[PDB]
Symmetry: D2
Subunit: 494 residues, 4 copies
């Protein structure tokens, strides 16, 4: 049950958000954001740069001052505010889902039923943590009373990508606000609209000015200004491995701010011969193609045991050929366009790369429409470990199917990667599942399922896929600064 969408939602927010108010960039510069389904400009947005970031950081620092409304507010009340924000987002769910689709390209039905639902669940989950992340009382040696206070890390710079605009914003705001930090968020230049509207809801919810500040703009400018800022205490980043390095270097070169990163991957989806065929085929399709293939944890290396390889491939190809590509506002559409021209070209390049290196093109492989950035669902068979399409994140509707013989062999091949964000195993056998979940070097291992996220379960990468974890109780660790208080007492007793 999905409410009919407004296929041309009006844009109400397109400026820089600081101290609960809207501002043009100091330079007065604006940049166009494009609708990927048509290739047309939606509207212009204030182009924030260093000077704007400076104003936002000063506002955040002021809201974080000892004795301020945000610092004195009961933890339980921060929880109330998050719950209020969630209620406001739900009130505007239909509008937000349509705006998300307009700026990003994902199907409206998905923006509505998936993205928005997950935003609401993330915020509501974290609202509950606001007054429950306890410090400790410690039985230290000697005549002392020792305890720890879980204080906020402080001014948190949050840089997010364009694949899940609203959800990425919620994943960042939820834990940061639940623990009493203040935020300077830099949204993606490709999808700034939905996050800016949410800023209006943050003000409406009652958050004190300066608690959340949003600066739309580009990376090397606004993003880098946050990473290198001398008064930003912590930075959280989700995006490319390349920029992840740039961020960590900027943090180390400036004030040693704390850093957490969520980068991409080349996640292996292992299908054992005893797996439920119909289920594994559908889930492998979902694992790769979901969100136009623009998922950090996309199952981009589909390993299939030799005995079921031929049948698995045949079914996967049929499924890929039936996938409906089109207007994301049409209910029948399964796949919208890629986010922008840059990604579009990059994917075309990877497809040509696959053909050049000898991977068997089974279907698709080309542009799916004249207007917009639509690419045909593409499947490569007989992919080998050394191929570039088997190693690098394509971030498009391009599936790699690899053949394997033994469970010991597949463990080694799946783990032979600098990435380690996620992995999956499809099998009916108890021992195979436990052997593989333990052996796989990945942040999340799904068993007989894929892309199953819960606000309660942590997510993050091993190796080069990132550091730190988001979601769950773990998502609060990077937003907390630990203080030990040790007091001399007359006579310590147990």
């Amino acid at each position: 049950a999905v409410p009919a969408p407004n296929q041309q939602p009006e844009v109400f927010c397109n400026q820089i958000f600081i101290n609960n108010e809207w501002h043009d960039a100091v330079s007065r510069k604006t940049f166009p954001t494009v609708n990927p389904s048509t290739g047309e400009v939606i509207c212009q947005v204030a182009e924030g740069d260093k000077e704007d970031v400076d104003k936002a950081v000063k506002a955040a620092r002021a809201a974080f001052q000892l004795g301020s409304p945000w610092r004195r507010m009961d933890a339980s009340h921060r929880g109330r505010l998050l719950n209020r924000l969630a209620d406001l987002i739900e009130r505007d769910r239909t509008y937000l889902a349509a705006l998300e689709t307009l700026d990003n390209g994902k199907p409206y039905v998905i923006s509505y039923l998936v993205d928005l639902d997950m935003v609401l669940k993330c915020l509501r989950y974290y609202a509950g943590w606001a007054d429950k992340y306890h410090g400790k009382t410690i039985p230290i040696d000697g005549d002392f009373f020792s305890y720890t206070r879980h204080e906020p890390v402080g001014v948190c710079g949050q840089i997010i990508p364009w694949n899940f605009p609203l959800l990425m914003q919620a994943w960042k705001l939820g834990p940061a606000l639940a623990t009493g930090n203040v935020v300077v968020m830099k949204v993606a230049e490709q999808t700034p609209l939905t996050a800016l509207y949410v800023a209006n809801l943050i003000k409406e919810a009652g958050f004190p000015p300066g608690v959340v500040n949003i600066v739309p703009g580009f990376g090397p400018t606004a993003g880098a200004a946050i990473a290198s800022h001398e008064d930003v205490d912590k930075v959280a980043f989700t995006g490319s491995t390349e920029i992840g390095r740039v961020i960590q270097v900027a943090a180390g070169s400036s004030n040693l701010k704390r850093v957490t990163l969520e980068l991409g991957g080349k996640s292996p989806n292992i299908i054992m011969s005893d797996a439920d065929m119909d289920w594994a085929v559908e889930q492998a399709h979902f694992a790769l193609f979901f969100n136009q293939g623009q998922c950090c944890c996309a199952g981009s290396r589909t390993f299939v045991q030799e005995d079921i390889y031929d049948e698995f491939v045949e079914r996967s190809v049929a499924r890929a050929k039936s996938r409906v590509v089109g207007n994301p506002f049409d209910s029948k559409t399964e796949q919208g366009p890629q986010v922008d021209e840059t990604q579009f070209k990059k994917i075309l390049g990877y497809i040509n790369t696959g053909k050049q290196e000898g991977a068997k093109l089974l279907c698709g492989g080309g542009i799916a429409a004249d207007r917009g950035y639509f690419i045909q669902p593409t499947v490569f068979g007989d992919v080998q470990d050394g191929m570039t399409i088997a190693k690098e994140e394509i971030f498009g509707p391009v599936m790699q199917i690899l053949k394997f013989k033994t469970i010991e062999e597949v463990v080694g091949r799946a783990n032979n990667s600098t990435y380690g964000l996620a992995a999956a195993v499809f099998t009916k056998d108890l021992d195979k599942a436990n052997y593989l979940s333990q052996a796989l070097q990945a942040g999340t291992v799904w068993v007989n399922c894929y892309d199953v996220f819960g606000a309660q379960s942590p997510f993050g990468g091993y190796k080069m896929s990132g550091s730190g974890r988001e979601l769950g109780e773990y998502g609060l660790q990077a937003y907390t600064e630990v203080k030990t208080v040790t007091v001399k007492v007359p006579q310590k007793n147990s």
Copy 2:
């Protein structure tokens, strides 16, 4: 009750430790380690460099392979091994305390009663954590069973300083080994001997080859090779803020290895007018002069309330004048030499700066002996916040005494620093203690005490004094990689 020290303990280990074997450097080069009390060379030590680090990392990686003895060992058994190492260290306590003094300069009585005791307590505390750092079972939405596995982060690079050679080594090995990680440690060129001898005990305790590897050598060579290694998963560093930046940049520039840092500070020790005079004077003396002033958390900014300033200063000067400086092996010696000539000259430079900038030299101020690196206990009065000696870490027996009037004033002055490792408050008033402990921006706030460490309580810095925490349950966080396993189940029930 301290056993007679061997004033010239024999050196048994002076090479690179890899796979439980001793190796010369690939280059065959060695460097001299000096006795700071005489300025004479104790012995030569293998000079490890990049190639030696590469050998160590490969050995560590092999020992960490799935199915290896270290990976399969019961968690409780890792605890047994840590307890066995502790027992071996206790057996060789008299010898290790003397060797520590010889290479570092600290008083033998202190090496024996403080350093060795703390090494033993740290290892025994962490031995207990080996089989108790649980993952979680999570009530995720939908028909799934979700849980987390707390796995070891992997190959851990550990770079440590010279101020507490043995203790720093135990603070690093304890949590790392308790959680099943493998180590490549780079000890300080000024004090490599005791850590190398402990490597012999690690082998004797029964730890599998490659679990702990030690590479003595210089920083820009061996240290940087670890920080920039493509196969090191995590790096923990303790030392200068300058090198802390270098380490974080190296991590970002290489493989995005996880990073934790423990840097210096300029910790404020606050004496309110209602403090117990005698206690505060002795504690402030200890707070600054302990370990030849070579403590990351030295109370180097002694703020004294105006009403008790004159008396506090008088008593402090008397205590500093009575402090016995001399041969560390003599039972009457309270202060040994500084670690090396570089530190020695750096401190004298700071003292000359203090004099030039207008601080009032109350006592000391010069060299304490013709041989070795001895410096007279120095006290500066009427110190102002803008003075060099009030801003920069001196790391020597140089005390700064500043005057203040109000509690709000002292809070602001204490917090006006880029450092935030520790702080202390001496007062008899409940409210003043609670106000200050909450307001101070420091990792550890001591109340009516100073330098009170316990393996049970975390330690680390705010701001530029570091990131991450060591000791306590918190010390296990940076040594754990979290994996989420989400399994589809027939029908989830509470």
Copy 3:
């Protein structure tokens, strides 16, 4: 800012609540509930007995069956339902606060600002815990995967008193529902109305039928039927020490159901000579007189240091003399009537005993009105430890002031009691505060405050004041049944 109350609120619910439906007692019998301010009957209420409890238990058991809506419901959704129930209670806040006052006697202003506020806070706090009480993954020896599931204890019998009708219902429902249990609640015969209306809100909120069942009626009938029921898995009781014994014996004699108890106390409020006089006097007054003295943790033993005894007593008498007793619906009323005639007479009897035993009657001591159960605020001075009023819980507006000399002395006298629910310490000294808080044998120790409750902090008794804790994370322990699952795996690795 309190909304004008309806001094004669209409009663909508007065029957037995089972399976989201209203039922008359099987016997068809009813009992009157009286307005303590006038002594008149408000209305009749179904008199539940054993047969009614049996129907309730069967309904709860059915709702708890594996595969039922309540068992399969996402933990996060149980949280949504608790939040919805809180929203409904807030919508009807004015009405419920009035109904509470009518049936109980407490001032409407307090019912509204305190009771209803705490009910909302408690339900909202527990709503947040619903999907966060994790089980554990455990590093057991051998080739096994071991973990724990935190399952609901099951059918929970909850017997509550009349002093805080709504709050007590919330304290019970919150943790029980957050953890997925089902409830058979027996409300006090003196104050059944507000809880019965909340039952209507539980249905409106959407809780499945049978999840919460409420049986109004007497103790030896309905109460005992629950405690002795062969199919009730856990019983939680709040009330007299006498009935607490009966409950534990019934549990042991039946099916060994789990038991938690919150009984009375004779809590010591200790005023040191260095305390803030004005604050201590007002807080000591509140500590004893709050809610007509009908608080389990009432500071009924006011220990005052000899140097400030006279002045403290004088100020306390003046405050007690000016305390407004009258119609609870009038905004100026500070104290309403005692709950019923039985309590009224028992309190007067204690006052008579106090006079007989030699305590100095300083003010009050008799009936405050001709109609209703109003008693004058009474203060006894020079009370001795051996006096009946110094040992037994009076549960009325009767204050005992005792004199002491030393801190060591007061610890012994404060601890010489079979009760140990709470205690307080008023002092400006840090060491005295820590010395006493550690030494006092009580579940809650307040320092420079009293009756400070938070849904985040646990509450419960030491000794005969009870067992187990309510509120906070601890409040979930007694509502969870722990299951260990240990699975054989091919090869265990860290």
Copy 4:
């Protein structure tokens, strides 16, 4: 590799242990303890009664007074003492194993390799918990600092059975001492020797006098005196359901002391048709026959799916017939005698009942030797749910094999019991394992294994099999009394 046993170990301790000293009973009475293998008296043991328990409780209370050596001792030192005790038990391992076998009857090889190993592991595990069971710092509403202290519950009465004398003592002492409590232990009259010798080791290890007191004697006398004592704060009991009831009633009728119970069971072991036959048969044999069938969690209801029933039974009967019964000191003996004449007769009675009720006797069924309490390994086939041997705990070498058809059917049958201590599932299917482990109403569910205990994983029963959990972190909960300290502060900040 088991050291040759002394088949006639000398007895050194046979009196009441109070204040680290040995005492005769006040009455001077003694009782004989018998060697079940021969029926002959080993020696006389002091017969403790109420008066001796009173002396013990006073000693424990004195040792628990604020300021005493035990109360002031650093928590880490409590860990050192537990580790020291384990070292002494390990030193005397061969002796203790032989004495255990002599008094209890179990094979020496098992006493040595299993019981003693588990005792050592349990004590060393808990030694590690001594300084790690943290309290909390809580973000309560308002201007307050609120935290909890995890204090010792106090004087703990521990009543243990005769099936695992040394292990049961360790399971009780480990958590109790790790948390700073004092103990009054009542060992089983059938097996008092090993526990008494351990008391000598407790003294040798350095535990303060009164911390551990042991009173050998009968149940209705010494045991009941502990359960009803007005100065015992908590009682932990392991034994029959019948006495568990008596204990809880005694607690409720006396001082409302806290209670935890570990009672019997009639644990179901479910073999699905897809199970590994060889492994399932061996494990089912072990599950039932381990320790002469004297295990609380014995797999006494072996459910076997119909398709594999015939083969499973034939293999089971073959294994039972080959089980070697004889002198427990002989290396080839798998089964020793039952603990005493009472159990011996009770088991023969259950066998008679099995024959009378129509269960198919497949092997054994009678006495296995003319001297000693030896019983033949007995197997009953075609057992039905309504049979006495299918419902009551036999506690002997008598196996019940039942046939089932579907997974839904077996869940209902397995759960249709007033017991719920443990259960097991043997299957290769991932879904069947998860479905069953979730559905079974038991404290511990083993998958493809049985009797897998670890000091790290909790153990306890559902329903009438008990309340509370032992082992793991959970084992510390019942030995902790929670105190909330809430302090008024000038201004609370996050």
